[PDB]
Assembly symmetry: C3
Homo-oligomer: 261 residues x 3
Amino acid sequence: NMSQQLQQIIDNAWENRAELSPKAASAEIREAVAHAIEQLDRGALRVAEKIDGAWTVHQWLKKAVLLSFRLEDNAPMPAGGYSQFYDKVPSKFANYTAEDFAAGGFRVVPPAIARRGSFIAKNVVLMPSYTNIGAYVDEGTMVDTWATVGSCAQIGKNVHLSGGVGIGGVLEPLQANPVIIEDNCFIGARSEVVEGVIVEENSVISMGVYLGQSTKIYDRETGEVTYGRIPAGSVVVAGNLPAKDGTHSLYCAVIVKKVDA
Amino acid sequence: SQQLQQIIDNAWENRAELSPKAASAEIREAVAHAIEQLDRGALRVAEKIDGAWTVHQWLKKAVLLSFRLEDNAPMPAGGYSQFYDKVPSKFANYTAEDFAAGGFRVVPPAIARRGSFIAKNVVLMPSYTNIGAYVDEGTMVDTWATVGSCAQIGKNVHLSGGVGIGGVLEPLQANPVIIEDNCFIGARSEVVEGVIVEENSVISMGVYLGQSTKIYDRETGEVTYGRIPAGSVVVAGNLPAKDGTHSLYCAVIVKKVD
Amino acid sequence: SQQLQQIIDNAWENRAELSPKAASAEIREAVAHAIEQLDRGALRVAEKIDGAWTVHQWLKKAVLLSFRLEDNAPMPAGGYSQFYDKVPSKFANYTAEDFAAGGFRVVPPAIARRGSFIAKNVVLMPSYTNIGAYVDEGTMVDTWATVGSCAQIGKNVHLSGGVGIGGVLEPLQANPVIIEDNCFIGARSEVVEGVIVEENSVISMGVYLGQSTKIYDRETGEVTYGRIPAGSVVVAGNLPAKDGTHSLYCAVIVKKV
């Protein structure tokens, strides 16, 4: 019922969001939004999860994230002299103590950063990389150099996001599922998964594979073209499909093998 | 301005005699003012004059001189590391009032070099904006994108994650990369070597455009180079070798919109 | 040095007994010295001996032991954020004179880990150089490029924007990624998993080379893996499936010197 009372406040604040700004918002609303962000940051709540067998989005948590923007002004952020930043979302690690880091059980390799309101699980290694607000990065996952975990993305356990991999954010539309990378997936260097595509568990995605909602996924075995989902245990490489007229071909992803756990 | 170009153009001719230890007060002030003007967007390395994109070579000269006139120095960062360069951050001396007046956001650890212009309502996710670049109003520069030296980025452009816009500081005469108003550039794409993407274009993911990239127009069968016409929808493709043994990467214009 | 390798090889066999709180002074000194020598370029993880690239497994062991011997600790950054890791920056303790003597540039926010060598006349645009890497004279590392663990980058190499050079710290016997002298690697390309790019090669944009990537030689029709021959010009392509329904990504050598 704690979460129920919390959602009630957030949902009403959202409907009445035109009343809210950094100078004007009730203590109840500010406290609710801050608590929602804190719970997302700790992984006690998560923007999407399995409900009754199916990935489901909690729209109210996306609303909380969006309200957290509305309620804060940008301010200068100090960095020891060489430069400054200017934003309204604090670093997840701004107020961490040595004890907080020890308890977290992950590594933050400089200059990696994550925004406040993302969860980083035990045994995660963040190479220099970016984790946006609302993201959930589960245990044992490797986020390699110049990778991005976009807003609200759900990254499973023991996932390997290779160098320069982009996982797209999906804070809006509110109803849309975020990008979901299930447990034990390998995503090869320079690949991209955006626009709510789901990569199911035990999949192996090679280098330079770009998966959005309009990317044709060609199953070599069956000849079927699908969109938006990599089935569990798929091995996926970059390819092309020929134009009927034989003059050119267009980029696609190809499922070249299917394996078990 | 003409007085400024006059001083820079003559300093360029005599640049062999310029160093961090030797340079007239007039030349140092002119170059410094040219950099300040680029930074504020009062001058720009290229602009559209009488309907045609035109380079101001003297402003490239100003940028190159600014390197010649300064030594590298350690740059502090609060302990974890240091840097060592001769070009300051655009934001080195910014006050809270400066950031407020600028009207853009700099999401940590994003940075821009001094002598680049960032317009109001721009959002810099962690990304890099090099010297001489111009990033116009409402543009979103996403995570690990790069706005290269002298690049001209239009209004309401979306540079998606990992997008590289190449620099063209040299050759002096060469147009920089130009992305016109309202363009979408999809994740992990690249536009380099003075390619122009005209307004209202939509470039998908993994599209790599340089001076030698074949641009195949699906409707007409024509191959062109160096320019994406206004309102083009562009995707990654391949063109077949005549002998049928393989195919080579190209960009394909699949639709034209407006 | 030989005495260094003996100490390190033995420490490696006993690595289960080593920790940030348990390790002899001899072992700590030996590992620290190995890291210092890698950092200075006096030692290197792989080198060309008699025309043949050869890995020194003991230097990889030294790098791995260096992790085992140190705890993660918070790393300060002037307020906006903090980091938490056990490998220091190469530049953590650099003086103005150290930077002067090194002869390279570190454009903010570029970073390199302690135990990597950066030669003179190198320019590091914002980029990452991991431990064990060797970046030789005159090389340009462009914005958001990565030089991975143990990578050997030759002289006068241009790693363009967003280029990833993969690391190969393990397996111990495996050659790291090697980019030989005077190579150009175009934007957003990737070289991983011990692929070697031989000298004077030109790799275009969006070329992704790993151990499974087919390298198609246009002139001969031959497919090979793991090696770009000296002077090759390489572009992204595809090879057609026999059944004509699709094609699959490959690299194509379109010209030689």
